[PDB]
Design an enzyme around this catalytic site. Structure first.
Site, PDB file in Angstrom:
ATOM      1  N   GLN A  89       0.828  -1.195   0.000  1.00 35.31           N
ATOM      2  CA  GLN A  89       0.000   0.000   0.000  1.00 35.31           C
ATOM      3  C   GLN A  89       0.870   1.255   0.000  1.00 35.31           C
ATOM      4  O   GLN A  89       2.031   1.243   0.420  1.00 35.31           O
ATOM      5  CB  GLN A  89      -0.931   0.007   1.212  1.00 35.31           C
ATOM      6  CG  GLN A  89      -2.176  -0.848   1.040  1.00 35.31           C
ATOM      7  CD  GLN A  89      -3.074  -0.823   2.261  1.00 35.31           C
ATOM      8  OE1 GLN A  89      -2.790  -0.133   3.240  1.00 35.31           O
ATOM      9  NE2 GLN A  89      -4.166  -1.576   2.208  1.00 35.31           N
TER      10      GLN A  89
HETATM   11  N1  GTP Z   1      -3.772 -14.884 -12.353  1.00 30.73           N
HETATM   12  C1  GTP Z   1      -2.911 -14.727 -11.345  1.00 30.73           C
HETATM   13  N2  GTP Z   1      -3.276 -14.081 -10.239  1.00 30.73           N
HETATM   14  C2  GTP Z   1      -2.275 -14.007  -9.332  1.00 30.73           C
HETATM   15  C3  GTP Z   1      -1.001 -14.493  -9.456  1.00 30.73           C
HETATM   16  N3  GTP Z   1      -0.267 -14.216  -8.315  1.00 30.73           N
HETATM   17  C4  GTP Z   1      -1.089 -13.576  -7.535  1.00 30.73           C
HETATM   18  N4  GTP Z   1      -2.324 -13.406  -8.093  1.00 30.73           N
HETATM   19  C5  GTP Z   1      -3.436 -12.725  -7.452  1.00 30.73           C
HETATM   20  O1  GTP Z   1      -3.121 -11.363  -7.306  1.00 30.73           O
HETATM   21  C6  GTP Z   1      -3.894 -10.817  -6.210  1.00 30.73           C
HETATM   22  C7  GTP Z   1      -2.992 -10.035  -5.287  1.00 30.73           C
HETATM   23  O2  GTP Z   1      -2.035 -10.918  -4.678  1.00 30.73           O
HETATM   24  P1  GTP Z   1      -1.383 -10.701  -3.239  1.00 30.73           P
HETATM   25  O3  GTP Z   1      -0.285 -11.680  -3.094  1.00 30.73           O
HETATM   26  O4  GTP Z   1      -2.458 -10.681  -2.208  1.00 30.73           O
HETATM   27  O5  GTP Z   1      -0.737  -9.238  -3.349  1.00 30.73           O
HETATM   28  P2  GTP Z   1       0.510  -8.378  -2.829  1.00 30.73           P
HETATM   29  O6  GTP Z   1       1.339  -7.907  -3.943  1.00 30.73           O
HETATM   30  O7  GTP Z   1       1.127  -9.110  -1.720  1.00 30.73           O
HETATM   31  O8  GTP Z   1      -0.196  -7.060  -2.285  1.00 30.73           O
HETATM   32  P3  GTP Z   1      -0.296  -6.294  -0.900  1.00 30.73           P
HETATM   33  O9  GTP Z   1      -1.265  -7.088  -0.097  1.00 30.73           O
HETATM   34  O10 GTP Z   1      -0.798  -4.949  -1.178  1.00 30.73           O
HETATM   35  O11 GTP Z   1       1.053  -6.310  -0.303  1.00 30.73           O
HETATM   36  C8  GTP Z   1      -4.604 -12.030  -5.600  1.00 30.73           C
HETATM   37  O12 GTP Z   1      -5.901 -12.190  -6.154  1.00 30.73           O
HETATM   38  C9  GTP Z   1      -3.696 -13.177  -6.029  1.00 30.73           C
HETATM   39  O13 GTP Z   1      -4.274 -14.456  -5.963  1.00 30.73           O
HETATM   40  C10 GTP Z   1      -0.627 -15.173 -10.635  1.00 30.73           C
HETATM   41  O14 GTP Z   1       0.465 -15.657 -10.934  1.00 30.73           O
HETATM   42  N5  GTP Z   1      -1.666 -15.237 -11.549  1.00 30.73           N
END
Ligand code: GTP
Ligand code: GTP
Ligand code: MG
Ligand code: MG
Lengths: 89, 1103, 184, 431
Positions: C70
């Protein structure tokens, strides 16, 4: 001082033989455990080798301290007046 | 290995609410938890996977809204234990770190009392938990006195405490002020407060010192975990204020350590990842390097290294030069250690320039062998450790192409340090440095060969590093001359005799690989070094010269050559003026001369084994005179080094007589032989005991060819000198050494028929066995104790030393009665009470009974003895332990032959002075009697032999009181029950008659009590025996000792309560009432009436 | 103080290792972290804070610190640059309307003095999503060749299938182990 | 003014040291702050022997706290009289021998002895007339006993003409559960028979039996056993911290109670056996105390002085009693004809009286003997040591770390020679 200020009045028990009643005997305080074992052997007609004596004071119910060393005296084990003497064979 | 206490620890943690109620079970549980958690104090990583759930069981109880104070206190204690076992740095990461755990833990810390030394742990771990929660990315304004103000107040309250909470408060302060929103708000105020506390505290005040330590730790932590572009503005004023604190001139180590840490952090912050103030910190660190404490110097070296790791090249060179300057001879060992630590810290990062290698290397040559004798013990262990660490760091500091010229000055320095040092840590550090250098560069000669032999475990044993490893490493040409040079120029000039002997043995073992070098360049120096003022040096110069001579003689012996094939006319000439230049300088005078007495002696034996060309010279006469003077003036030597010197002198004299004193093969000079034996036997009557012992040992160490035609004279002399004369009754060592010499002579001369005045035969063996048997019986006693035993053992070893000789040559000389008496004496000795003597007698008996070459003739009960003492149950049987000796030795009583002496020997341990020995002997006797308690014949024979032993041992208090106590113990057990049937039993009347005369008119409460007990126990036998016992008891009741009277009364009451048939029904009650209402320790006037009434009641006559 | 006490501490510090995985939200940081240890990835909510995960791989005890992507948290990432040996940067391939921003946050991190000495590891996530710029296309949009003071190596992966994750783990563990013996 | 430098080693050693320090501070008019608040002149008479005068008339303990684990050090520093100690004397690591004597004498011991010697020298420098050192440790672990023997050997190479007291505590299978304990109670003796002048043996089996029988406690703990050790230590150092007719300090006490160079194992005692809870008890008399102090039940060791010959005996009284009474009672005790005649009491028995009594009691007496009965304890360990040495099971931990079979054989031979000498002197008589 009169040979009656040393005698500890102890009640003897027989957990193995419950049919026998209770006997309260006055034994000298400085009487070694070997002498008491010999007396019990001559009384109950049980050999000295097969005898185990224990003392239990009324202030600590449930406790049973064994008497292993036969050369010590009853006063060494903190045997106060009115303590129960259990014999096992 | 793994966490085996998983379920146990889980159950112990679960059982907590039902434990804090009391205080005993709580302490027991705490002790159990501590004992279980301290086992992983060396390998804490094992608790890594099992640390996630454990904490989960200790924190949930703390967060409960219905938990008492004791429960949360115990939980905090368990948490602190887990943290002090594993590690707060690796244990706080698993703690809660959300923004909803900041007010439950900060406000929880405000419920603790800083003056509660009972529940103090709670006030410690909680500060760490607060520092943990302070790592959230959210701000404090969104959660809102504010939280930051309360945190600052708490930190400024625990930083001034002398309890463990100071470290937690400092950690919290370091983790709080170093935040984004906390830096631009609460920072200058805390800095000003710390400056005021530093300018308001002292080193003399106990509170002031604590405050200074706390504020210094806080500043150091803030500068370590702080930013570089934010702490620089205030760093100037911080250093300006710290310069005035006068920490270097203080009497506190922690204050100086924290100041050095804070000044090296300030210096690091001043530089970038030269401004003003860097030179100040540099000079401060250079000055602090010369501290006495080890932690201060280590911190200074670490700071200097960290500073050099960020400064230009010129500054690094200047720092290296300043560090090297701290190595002059005028400096102290502390300065050398600091310089070595600084050099190691600089080389660990790779900052030193090649141009300095020309000097630093030299500093190492004098650092790996720093030894400066400072009074009693020497110093330089930490210096050697620092030098080894520097050498290890050099493996990665410079490159191999640059260190190439110093590959023999570093590989030979590491080899000499990892094998010829006195401390194990230094040797291990040197070995580790050598291994690292071989693994990194790999340029040392035979690195794998040195690493395989000198392993991490083999180097631990010092004795092995001077023999096996030393020779294996010196086998190569690159470690042949340097090793010997170092051993001769360092190890030989030590201040410890053990180190000198070890170095001498190492040189002896190494000389076999370089005979030429050890006889052309090593001998000339050691031969001239024997005339130095120092005593230890001359002592190490005589030992080194004696070992090289022996090695050269041995090497020659391989080629059927002489030891002069290696030693020139100048060597032998200088080795012949060693005993002459000492006698000339009265070196043998004083306790310092005693060292030269142990040196020249070693030089007489070695030279006597090499067959040197000294036969027919004054050197032999000088050596003989020196040996005689050393053997005569033995009383002027400390008892510690009295036996070693005597043995060395005896060995030297024996070697001299066997080598030089020899006219023709199998003959000797009649003149010298007549001159020796004369004084040798004339001094055997020397009123001095030490001189007598020395001369006896000298006579016993003579060869066989010298005793030809004069063996009978020496035999009769040694027989007459070993006697308990009225003027020498306490001469135990004299008789011991005489018996030892007699045994040595009997063993060295052998056997030869038709030769009484030359060897042992049938005309003197009968006079040798008689003297041995006479000396066997010896129970002398004096103020020192029962020293006679020291002779008894020496007799045993003799009886065997001869038995195995004749048995191997002319066994017919061994008679039957003599062998029977010897076996009886051995059994009696084995039946003793002492552990060492008992074990020795048992071993002698097992060796005499398990000799089969030929077996020894005439052994009473050979088959029974072999069956009772199997061959396999020899090494496993612990004769020293009474439990594993009494039940195995009491079985000998069953044999009629081994029944008198065995019982006589057992009587002393049955009635002895030890509680464990008496108990074991009584148990063994009872177990043995249980098997022969039916047949009256065995009991009758036992009673008869016991009466005989008591009647042949009357008024010998050595055996009367033990026998009486054994009788009392046997009667108390009741082993004569069948004898109580008939009246007036023979063993019941003889024993009573014996006991009365035995204690009759006794002024000993020891034998009086035994007699009283025996009389009280003998009342079981009916008839006139009981009447006589009662009469004797009533008579002795009126003794002049109230203690005796009261003890007799108590024993009478006991034996009356035991046996009921002793008194009638209407008389026993009256007797008991009279005995219970009488004072047996008051005026005898009133006791006389009571005694008379008791006698009238029991029918005892009225004397 | 000698080799028997200093070597015992250096061997333990080398075994431990820290890795800070930063990036913007919706990138796939938490999903990739959960896939590494092998856990569920069907319910992943926004991480409003920071989490720590201890793992064991090839004997290298690693401690991954996952911080939310964020914007409000971007002003607090400085509290996790202490003793950071590596920096993992997840870049969303199926979102071209915010790639340039990912470069900005990637330029300030390398400028930090505490993050120096580490190794960068770029991971192009969502490569199973149609419209996911390839690793060659992402190698130029983020300007990887411009970096020189620090090492880097792009390698596309996927948080769903979990491919090219462990392959990049070995390269990261080998680069740090190559300079762990001597830093200079 | 003879000063004494106290040293602590091991958990139990540090605990008993802190307990004794607190007890003496509570009896010499010294408060935790370190300021003297007394009501007599018998306290600040020999106080320089156990304390140093600092700024503001404060008295500071001369105790050096050394260990290999920080838990016990922090617990002692945060106790009642923790701040009074010098934080600059707290030497401690983070590993610990681990119950192994090789790791506590060679592996970790030598790494910290280099720093401990600095503090030892710093403390010995302030002493005007240095008298020696008094260590307090146990004989059932690797850290405590190992570091103690190492420091003693170092104090015998740097302070050879100095007194060396060792209040060792022999372990017991009843209190501990480790199997190598006998080893820790064997090799240490080699060091405690060759590098020591006095060794006050404190059996952990006798104290446990006294707590289980006399005190009649349900589950005796280490706090109950530390209350008794502290009382014994305070009673032993009575004449050393207070005046009297018996002016025997560390050296004079060793010159008057060590009749042999090798045989110097004492058996202290304490007649008024007080528990850790309450301390109010009737004021005993002179004869009653003299009769109860010589009883085997009131002994700290598991040995019977009756079964053995007495060497040297000393009795120190501390109550509202007279030395004239102490001498009239002693003369009566050694007379057969008198009604007050008892045994196990030879004629060579010194006497002393202390104006300042122990805390909680009004009349107390402390007996310090040297009878040969102590040998009975040594044998108790022999059967537990050699039984394993013949197998060489756990001997690898020592060999591979530094020790060797030669050291074990030498220690066994020394123990056997000591036992033989004790058994020989047991029957010592002269006329
Ligand atoms: N299609 C697809 N979706 C993915 C992939 N990796 C992650 N996602 C999706 O992307 C979204 C965000 O993923 P997170 O891992 O929660 O995000 P983050 O980057 O850690 O984000 P913050 O919580 O803000 O730190 C979720 O719906 C995941 O399941 C991927 O390889 N393919
Ligand atoms: N009387 C008594 N004995 C104790 C006490 N604490 C420990 N012991 C005994 O001390 C012996 C050895 O344990 P410690 O002294 O704690 O060990 P250490 O000396 O610290 O050694 P390491 O475990 O190697 O670190 C055992 O026999 C324990 O029973 C105590 O407070 N009182
Ligand atoms: Mg996330
Ligand atoms: Mg410990």
């Amino acid at each position: 001082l009169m040979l009656k200020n040393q005698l500890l009045t102890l009640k003897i028990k027989y957990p193995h033989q419950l049919d026998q009643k209770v006997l309260e005997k006055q034994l000298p305080g400085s009487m070694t455990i070997q002498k008491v074992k010999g007396l019990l052997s001559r009384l109950l007609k049980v050999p000295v080798s097969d005898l185990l004596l224990s003392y239990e004071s009324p202030k600590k119910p449930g406790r049973e301290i064994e008497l292993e060393n036969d050369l010590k005296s009853l006063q060494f084990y903190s045997v106060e007046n009115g303590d129960c003497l259990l014999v096992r064979w | 290995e793994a966490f085996g206490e998983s379920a146990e620890t889980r159950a112990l943690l679960g059982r907590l609410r039902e434990v804090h109620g009391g205080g005993a079970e709580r302490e027991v549980a705490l002790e159990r938890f501590r004992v279980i958690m301290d086992k992983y104090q060396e390998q804490p990583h094992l608790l890594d996977p099992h640390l996630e759930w454990m904490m989960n069981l200790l924190l949930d109880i703390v967060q409960d809204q219905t938990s008492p104070a004791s429960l949360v206190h115990l939980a905090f204690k368990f948490l602190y234990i887990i943290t002090k076992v594993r590690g707060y740095k690796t244990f706080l990461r698993l703690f809660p770190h959300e923004v909803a755990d900041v007010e439950p833990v900060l406000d929880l810390v405000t419920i603790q009392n800083p003056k509660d030394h009972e529940a103090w742990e709670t006030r410690y771990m909680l500060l760490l938990w607060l520092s943990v929660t302070c790592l959230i990315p959210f701000d404090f304004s969104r959660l809102d006195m504010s939280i930051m103000d309360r945190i600052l107040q708490i930190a400024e309250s625990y930083l001034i405490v002398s309890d463990k909470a100071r470290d937690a408060a400092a950690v919290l302060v370091s983790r709080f002020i170093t935040r984004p929103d906390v830096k631009q708000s609460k920072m200058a105020e805390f800095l000003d407060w710390s400056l005021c506390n530093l300018a308001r505290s002292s080193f003399q005040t106990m509170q002031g010192v604590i405050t200074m330590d706390g504020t210094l730790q806080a500043l150091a932590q803030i500068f370590k975990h702080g930013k570089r572009e934010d702490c620089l503005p205030y760093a100037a004023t911080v250093l300006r204020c710290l310069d005035g604190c006068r920490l270097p001139e203080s009497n506190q180590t922690l204050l100086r350590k924290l100041g050095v840490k804070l000044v090296q952090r300030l210096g690091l912050t001043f530089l970038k990842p030269v401004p003003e103030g860097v030179e100040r910190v540099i000079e401060q660190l250079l000055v602090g390097l010369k501290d006495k404490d080890t932690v201060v110097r280590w911190s200074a070296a670490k700071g200097i290294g960290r500073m050099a790791g960020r400064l230009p090249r010129a500054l690094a060179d200047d720092v290296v030069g300043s560090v090297l300057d701290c190595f002059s001879f005028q400096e102290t060992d502390k300065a050398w250690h600091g310089g070595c630590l600084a050099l190691a810290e600089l080389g660990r990062r790779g900052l030193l320039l090649p141009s300095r290698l020309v000097d630093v290397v030299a500093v190492i040559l004098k650092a790996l062998t720093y030894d400066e004798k400072r009074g009693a013990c020497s110093v330089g262990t930490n210096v050697r450790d620092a030098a080894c660490y520097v050498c290890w760091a050099f493996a990665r500091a410079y490159e191999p192409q640059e260190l190439k010229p110093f590959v023999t000055a570093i590989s030979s320095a590491l080899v000499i340090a990892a094998v010829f040092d006195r401390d194990i840590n230094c040797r291990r550090a040197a070995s580790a440095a050598f291994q690292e250098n071989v693994g990194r560069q790999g340029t040392f000669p035979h690195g794998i060969d040195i690493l395989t032999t000198a392993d991490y475990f083999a180097v631990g044993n010092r004795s092995n590093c001077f023999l096996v490893i030393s020779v294996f490493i010196a086998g190569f040409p690159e470690y042949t001359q340097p090793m010997i040079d170092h051993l001769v120029t360092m190890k030989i000039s030590h201040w410890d005799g053990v180190i000198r002997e070890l170095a001498a043995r190492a040189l002896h073992n190494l000389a076999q690989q370089a005979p030429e070098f050890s006889a052309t360049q090593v001998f000339p120096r050691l031969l001239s070094m024997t005339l130095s003022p120092d005593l230890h040096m001359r002592h190490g110069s005589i030992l080194a010269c004696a070992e090289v001579a022996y090695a050269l003689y041995k090497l020659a012996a391989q080629e059927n050559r002489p030891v002069t094939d290696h030693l020139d006319e100048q060597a032998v000439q200088g080795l012949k003026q060693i005993h002459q230049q000492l006698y000339d300088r009265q070196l043998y005078r004083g306790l310092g001369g005693q060292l030269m007495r142990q040196a020249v002696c070693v030089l007489i034996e070695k030279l006597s084994l090499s067959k040197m060309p000294f036969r027919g010279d004054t050197v032999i006469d000088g050596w003989q005179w020196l040996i005689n003077d050393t053997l005569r003036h033995l009383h002027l030597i400390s008892s510690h080094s009295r036996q070693q010197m005597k043995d060395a002198a005896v060995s030297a004299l024996a070697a001299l007589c066997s080598e030089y004193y020899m006219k023709e093969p199998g003959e000797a000079d009649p003149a010298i032989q007549e001159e020796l034996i004369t004084q040798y036997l004339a001094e055997l009557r020397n009123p001095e005991e030490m001189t007598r012992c020395g001369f006896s040992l000298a006579l016993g160490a003579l060869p066989g060819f010298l005793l030809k035609g004069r063996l009978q004279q020496v035999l009769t002399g040694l027989r007459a000198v070993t006697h308990t004369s009225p003027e020498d009754v306490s001469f135990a060592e004299s008789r011991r050494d005489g018996l030892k010499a007699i045994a040595r002579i009997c063993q060295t001369v052998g056997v030869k028929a038709g030769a009484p005045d030359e060897a042992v035969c049938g005309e003197n063996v009968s006079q040798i066995y008689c003297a041995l048997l006479g000396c066997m019986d010896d129970y002398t006693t004096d103020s020192r104790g029962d020293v006679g035993t020291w002779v008894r053992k020496a007799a045993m070893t003799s009886l065997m030393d001869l038995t195995l000789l004749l048995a191997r040559s002319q066994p017919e000389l061994i008679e039957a009665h003599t062998c029977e008496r010897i076996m009886c004496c051995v059994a009696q000795q084995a039946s003793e009470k002492i552990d060492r003597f008992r074990a020795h007698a048992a071993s002698v008996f097992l060796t005499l009974l398990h000799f089969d070459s030929p077996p020894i003739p005439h052994v009473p009960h050979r088959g029974e003895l072999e069956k009772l003492f199997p061959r396999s149950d020899v090494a496993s049987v612990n004769w020293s332990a009474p439990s594993q000796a009494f039940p195995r030795i009491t079985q000998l009583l069953g044999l009629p032959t081994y029944r008198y002496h065995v019982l006589l020997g057992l009587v002393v341990s049955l009635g002895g002075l030890t509680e464990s020995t008496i108990r074991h002997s009584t148990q063994s006797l009872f177990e043995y009697m249980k098997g022969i308690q039916s047949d009256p014949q065995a009991l009758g024979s036992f009673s008869g032999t016991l009466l005989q032993i008591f009647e042949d041992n009357l008024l010998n208090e050595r055996v009367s009181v033990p026998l009486l106590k054994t009788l009392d113990h046997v009667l108390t057990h009741g082993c004569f029950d069948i004898f109580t049937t008939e009246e007036d039993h023979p063993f019941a009347v003889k024993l009573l008659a014996l006991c009365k005369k035995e204690i009759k008119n006794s002024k000993d409460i020891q034998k009086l009590l035994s007699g009283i007990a025996v009389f009280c126990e003998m009342v079981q036998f009916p008839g006139d025996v009981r009447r006589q016992a009662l009469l004797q008891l009533c008579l002795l009741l009126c003794h002049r000792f109230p203690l005796i009277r009261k003890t007799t009364a108590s024993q009478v009451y006991e034996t009356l309560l035991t046996y009921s048939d002793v008194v009638g029904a209407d008389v026993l009650d009256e007797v008991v009432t009279v005995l219970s209402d009488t004072a047996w320790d008051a005026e005898l006037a009133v006791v006389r009436e009571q005694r008379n009434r008791l006698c009238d009641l029991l029918g005892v006559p009225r004397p | 103080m000698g080799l028997l006490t200093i070597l015992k501490k250096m061997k333990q510090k080398e075994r431990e290792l820290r890795l800070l995985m930063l990036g913007l939200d919706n990138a796939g940081k938490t999903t990739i972290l959960k896939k590494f240890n092998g856990e569920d990835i069907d319910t992943i909510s926004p991480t409003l804070g920071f989490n720590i995960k201890t793992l064991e791989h090839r004997g290298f005890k690693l401690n991954i610190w996952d911080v939310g992507g964020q914007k409000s948290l971007r002003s607090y990432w400085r509290n996790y640059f202490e003793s950071t040996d590596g920096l993992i940067w997840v870049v969303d391939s199926a979102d071209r309307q915010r790639m340039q921003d990912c470069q900005r946050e990637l330029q300030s991190l390398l400028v930090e003095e505490r993050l120096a000495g580490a190794t960068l590891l770029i991971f192009a996530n969502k490569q199973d999503l149609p419209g996911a710029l390839s690793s060659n296309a992402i190698r130029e949009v983020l300007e990887l060749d411009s970096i020189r003071s620090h090492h880097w190596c792009i390698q596309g992966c996927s948080a769903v299938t979990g491919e090219n994750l462990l392959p990049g783990i070995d390269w990261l563990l080998d680069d740090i182990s190559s300079r762990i013996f001597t830093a200079d | 003014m003879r000063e004494i430098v106290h040293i602590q080693a091991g958990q139990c050693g540090n605990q008993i040291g802190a307990k004794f320090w607190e007890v003496i501070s509570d009896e010499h008019g010294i408060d935790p702050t370190g300021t003297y608040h007394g009501d007599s002149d018998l306290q600040l008479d020999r106080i320089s022997v156990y304390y140093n005068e600092a700024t503001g008339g404060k008295y500071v303990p001369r105790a050096i706290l050394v260990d290999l684990e920080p838990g016990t050090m922090d617990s002692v520093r945060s106790g009642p009289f923790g701040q009074i100690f010098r934080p600059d004397n707290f030497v401690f690591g983070q590993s610990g021998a681990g119950n192994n004597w090789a790791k506590g004498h060679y592996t970790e011991g030598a790494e910290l002895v280099d720093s401990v010697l600095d503090v030892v020298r710093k403390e010995a420098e302030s002493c005007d007339c240095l008298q020696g050192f008094q260590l307090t440790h146990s004989l059932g672990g690797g850290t405590g006993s190992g570091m103690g023997t190492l420091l003693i050997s170092k104090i015998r190479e740097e302070y050879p003409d100095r007194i060396m007291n060792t209040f060792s505590v022999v372990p017991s299978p009843k209190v501990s559960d480790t199997v190598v304990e006998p080893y820790n109670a064997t090799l240490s003796v080699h060091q405690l028979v060759e590098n020591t002048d006095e060794t006050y043996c404190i059996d952990n089996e006798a104290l446990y039996d006294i707590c289980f029988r006399t005190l009649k406690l349900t589950t005796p703990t280490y706090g109950d056993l530390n209350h008794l050790v502290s009382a014994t230590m305070s009673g032993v150092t009575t004449c050393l911290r207070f005046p009297g007719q018996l002016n025997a300090d560390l050296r004079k006490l060793a010159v008057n109670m060590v009749p042999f160079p090798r045989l110097h194992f004492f058996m202290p005692g304490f007649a008024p056996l007080t528990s850790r809870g309450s301390q109010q008890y009737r004021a005993l008399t002179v004869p009653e105390l003299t009769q109860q102090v010589f009883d085997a039940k009131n002994m700290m060791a598991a040995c019977d002085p009756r079964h053995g010959r007495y060497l040297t005996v000393a009795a120190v009284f501390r109550g509202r009693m007279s030395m004239k009474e102490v001498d009239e009672q002693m003369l009566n005790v050694q007379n057969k004809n008198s009604s007050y005649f008892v045994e196990w009491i030879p004629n060579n028995v010194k006497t002393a009286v202390c104006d300042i009594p122990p805390r909680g009691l009004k009349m107390a007496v402390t007996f310090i003997g040297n009878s040969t009965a102590i040998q009975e304890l040594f044998k108790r360990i022999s059967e537990q040591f050699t039984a394993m040495f013949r197998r060489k099971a756990f001997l690898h931990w020592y060999t591979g770390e530094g020790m060797d079979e030669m050291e074990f054989t030498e220690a066994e031979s020394n123990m056997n020679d000591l036992v033989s000498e004790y058994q020989q002197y047991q029957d010592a008589t002269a006329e």
